[PDB]
Amino acid sequence: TFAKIKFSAQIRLETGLHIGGSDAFAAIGAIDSPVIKDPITNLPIIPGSSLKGKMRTLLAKVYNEKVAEKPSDDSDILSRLFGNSKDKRFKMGRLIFRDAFLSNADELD
RNA sequence: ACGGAAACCUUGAUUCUAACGCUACUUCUAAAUAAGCGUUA
To answer: Which of A2, A5, A85, A88 is the most buried (most CB within 10 A)?
Structure first.
């Protein structure tokens, strides 16, 4: 059965978040450590690469049953969802992450 | 059988050290617990 399930949620920060972007890329920021933003709305975002990497690192301490010096000698559980470039049968995972844009700018205003 | 696959803008950092809400200034100035004894008898 070919289906696609979509875990949707609202990530509410409970402390200040600093994902951090390049100084000249996310606009020229006067501050020394700017956060990553949307190139048009100039609102902070949570890129899907951030969530994917942090989730893979966290589940790499639980569902690995061993240690890995690279994200290639990983468990089948992590490879099947996030992907492994050197494995033929998991060259792309079953999880697709998305950028998380600001959703409550009205409420903040 | 998508110039594509895999990749945390990440690790370590105390908005901290020093500093008397302090110096000067009389609750003070005059003041008898005292005055009046009528008229009748």
So the answer is: A85
Radius of gyration of chain A, Cα coordinates, nearest whole angstrom? 17
Query: Which residues have CB atoms below 7 Å from chain B, the nucleic strand?
Result: A 18-22, 47, 49-50, 52-54, 56-57, 71-72, 82-85, 91-93
What does the alpha-carbon distance between residue A97 and residue A7 come to, in Å, rounded to a whole number?
A: 10
Distance CA A25, CA A38 (A): 10
A105, A108, A107, A109: which is closest to A41 by C-alpha?
A105
Let me know: does A60 contact A47? Beta carbons within 8 Å.
Answer: no
Cα gap A27→A39, rounded to integer Å: 8
Q: Which residue is nearest to nucleotide B6 (CA to C1')?
A: A85
For residue A6, give Cα distances in angstroms to A47, A98, A101: 17, 11, 17
Experimental structure resolution, Å: 2.7
